[PDB]
């Protein structure tokens, strides 16, 4: 008998990687092409991204399947450890059977081999439950609809971490300069090659700032959760979902455009990126004030102390999303700074949420 | 007042990342050039190897001051949470700079930068502490050299699941068949161009079977251990360095090669690379037994019931590398199928281990 935290751990970093694994090839393309091939590749794009919120949500599928599996079983050992590894061997195959089946949706060997893979993961987790089964002391207590907490968190946080990290990862394997374009593009001058590649550190900056406020948002929201709920899951599975696209669209605003056109336009699409990705944090957490009593510490509750804290804390970046888009459609001339300080703003608002917060409800008492 | 653990499973997390980033240049290198271009190559893979390690050790060192410093901070709150995700930023500019700092060494920019970086993480981490002791309920209680086992194990778990999971990545990053090369190169089939990308998926699956059960025998290790020292961390961040050239080493041995003597001296690498990344295990368990009463459970002391079955879990792999090694050596004409075989073998030996422990044993007893 060994307690199986962190088999489980293991499984939803492991999982938490294979759901994010189809953003690379979104965040991997050409920016743009410079020469008016606008059709072509924005059609990738979407192609692209449409295959990676599939893909992400049959891996979530199938981690909430493996969460169930082993919240009816309890313990592990050597053998359902052993299991579990062949378990995650199976997921791991998900993606490219699916990017097949939808790359070539004529011949039946993709979608065979999709079928393969999934009744793969099904004969594992039946051979798990009859392993458990079979022995006793390998089942929970009460065997002997809420989705565990622990898991939730391990799946986002590792989420969280990808999405934080996938451009310093580009930028530390390509963007390093080379000595020979240093001193014979830039004559001789390692500082001017290195101010080239500013509008990818920057979009590093912003990406990793944003992502790490709405972790920290989730964070917050989560300390104070009793229970987890298959709705909340799946709002905040979307949330997730949603999450990844924010390298693409820092990536987007950061490089310089043809005409302000495409610059208010990138502006509006990161806006509602942002926007999505907060609104469905900001979604659980209203699910949940639903059933307060069974699904909410006190503190956060109608009338709670820590109760407009937290809904401030996740109603800030939808706000200011939705007023810079609100910005873009009506000022229209002073969009890209309002979106830029915003950016500096949003982070200074959490820092000092607080502070914030007590003045409002002063303003609001003695008007 | 809250609690730590996610905030410190999170920064696992992200340094895990950080401390893999530099192993992407190495898996992503010309596996031959088939022209004898064999002097460059080898050489810039040498040099990138060098890089590798020096960046994941430097990372370690970095994550193990995080550890000290939030050991003597207990529980954390909204500021230390984002002084926290500042330090973060901070530390994953360090591969980057360091880098930089090995390819100019003549340009003072480069140490400058790296410095630079070093004095503002500890800028970020005196800053935590200052707050942490200007308010004291957020020092730990002993406040108000042993490592914590929890971030170890998190950052090894990060580790081997990045390294299980890259060459799926690439995999399903590339090597998803266009159909202009299916129905133009391969003849209108798609399973031809599927079979021709089979060494690929030998070389994943191969990979992801040895860390899984290294990460099977570091899971039971670990489950076993009271308290982990820093001569233990330091075995155990050299075994993780070593883990991250498996992919590289699968990749070289699934490739075919020009000569056999290349095959022979594939597979000894392999092994080589195994051989370390599991005596550091072994020596980890060793050195906890030399101090086994503050150290380990006595399950698994100098006669205890899962002694010996320890000894085994941990030194199954280099024993077989090992004798891998000789085949190579001295045999040298079934050295190839000896690795196969070890391959496929050593999996069956983990499942079956206590039957086998057993076995050898009674041999033991009425002999
Ligand atoms: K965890
Ligand atoms: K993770
Ligand atoms: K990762
Ligand atoms: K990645
Ligand atoms: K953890
Ligand atoms: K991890
Ligand atoms: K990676």
Redesign the interface.
Known sequence: I??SQ??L??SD??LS??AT??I??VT?TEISPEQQFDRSVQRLLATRIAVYLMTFLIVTVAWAAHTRLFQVVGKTD??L??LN?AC??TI??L??TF??MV??PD?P??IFLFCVCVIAIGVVQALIVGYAFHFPHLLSPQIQEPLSKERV??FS??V???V??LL??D???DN????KD?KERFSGS??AA?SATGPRFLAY?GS??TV?LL??AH??L??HVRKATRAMGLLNTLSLAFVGGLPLAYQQTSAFARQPRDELERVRVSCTIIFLASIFQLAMWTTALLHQAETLQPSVWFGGREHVLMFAKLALYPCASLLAFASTCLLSRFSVGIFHLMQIAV?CA??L??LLVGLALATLRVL
């Open positions: 060994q307690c962190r088999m751990s293991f970093a492991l990687i294979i694994v189809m690379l090839p991997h050597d053998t450890a052993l590894l995650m061997m791991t195959f993606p490219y990017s097949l790359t070539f011949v060997l993709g968190e391990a946080d590792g969280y971490a990808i934080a990290t310093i990862l930028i530390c394997e390093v300069p080379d000595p240093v390692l500082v290195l900056f990793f700032a790490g972790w920290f964070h917050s989560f300390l982070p959490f820092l949420l607080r």
